[model samples]
Target: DPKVVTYEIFGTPGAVVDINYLDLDARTQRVNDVTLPWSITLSTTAPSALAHIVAQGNADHIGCRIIVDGELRVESVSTGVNAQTYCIEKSA
Candidate 1:
């Protein structure tokens, strides 16, 4: 199966979210003022020594997920203002 890394961020509807992640080339990518169910995917063919994401929200609930090749690699959830999910480096 062709493997890919997917990053997702969620929060209360219309809530502001900021996301930062590494792209397919392991380059930093960032987005701001995003709402619920923010999603991105990276298509990679070689082994990367870095996989990370930081999702921040200004809503009552916030969560993030890092999925690798259909496997859940990271899952984070929180309920509060200024919630954040920080997924550090992982090799794949």
Candidate 2:
């Protein structure tokens, strides 16, 4: 069984973004060390899984970063995708 977990991001100064995971628990931590373009992603597989949250300064470059439990999970310095989305699944 997959467990739901909650997480918070402090990438942006004076602001915070809260997110939840489908089957993973991540602790709260500072993702950025005095920098810009920060992001995070939560994923699980029951029906399917996906990722979002990133930054891009150009059309050919995209920055993606994911942190879990005060640790780095996945990060991409450059990618082709430039957008964000949220996904949720209910078990019955």
Candidate 3:
């Protein structure tokens, strides 16, 4: 079976948030004004692969999570007026 990876973002509901992530293909992507509690799942074959996410929120709190093979691997959180968080995980 291929490696299953999931990236999750959390923030205040309906709040404007900036999201940046590395996709399954190792491509960087950006989107503005995204809502909270969003996630994506993908699978990849690998010797070594990186799963990374960054988020900034207008809300007081912002968090990111990376799950590999159905287990939570890394989680990060920040709290401020314009809060930011990043989470990264590697598969071997």
Candidate 4:
């Protein structure tokens, strides 16, 4: 089941996330002057075999979440702004 992988996460800007021993910034949007749903893109080689998309990130005082193929990967508890990551792994 190794194929192409595309993972997306929604969060606000300035989100903090630790990935591969590095912090990252998340992409976000403002709705009516209110920080609304934000999104980030994680893409890599499909591996042409069994692969998975790991979406990870965090924001300041705000947790992060991951949605792979329409599934929540992380919960809303991480406190960091604009931090995320992706990786390819063997598919189950």
Please name the candidate that would achieve the greatest TM-score relative to the true structure: 3
Candidate 2 C-alpha lDDT tens digits along 1-92: 44222222233343222333333322223332322333334444443333234232222343333443344445444334432223322221
Give the per-residue lDDT digits (tens) of candidate 3, residues 1-92: 79888898886777678888888889998988788878888788774688898988687888888988888889888888888889988661
1-92: candidate 1 lDDT, tens digit per residue: 44588887776777888888888776898898888778887776675546788878677788778888887887888887688877754775
With a 3 Å backbone cut-off (N, CA, C), the pairs that clash in candidate 2 are 27-69
Q: What is the lDDT of residue 22 in candidate 2?
A: 34
Which regions of candidate 4 deviate over 4 angstroms?
1-37, 45-60, 78-92
What lDDT tens digits, residue by residue, belong to model 4 across residues 13-78? 544333321111222222122132434444334433332323344443433344445545444433
lDDT of 4: 0.36
What lDDT does the true structure give each of the candidates?
0.78, 0.33, 0.83, 0.36
Worst 10 residues of 1 by lDDT: 41-50
Q: lDDT for model 2, please.
A: 0.33
Each candidate structure's TM-score, on Cα atoms with residue i matched to residue i, is 0.84, 0.28, 0.88, 0.31
Which predicted model would earn the best lDDT? Answer: 3
Q: Would you list the rank order by lDDT, best first?
A: 3, 1, 4, 2
Q: What is the lDDT of residue 5 in candidate 4?
A: 31
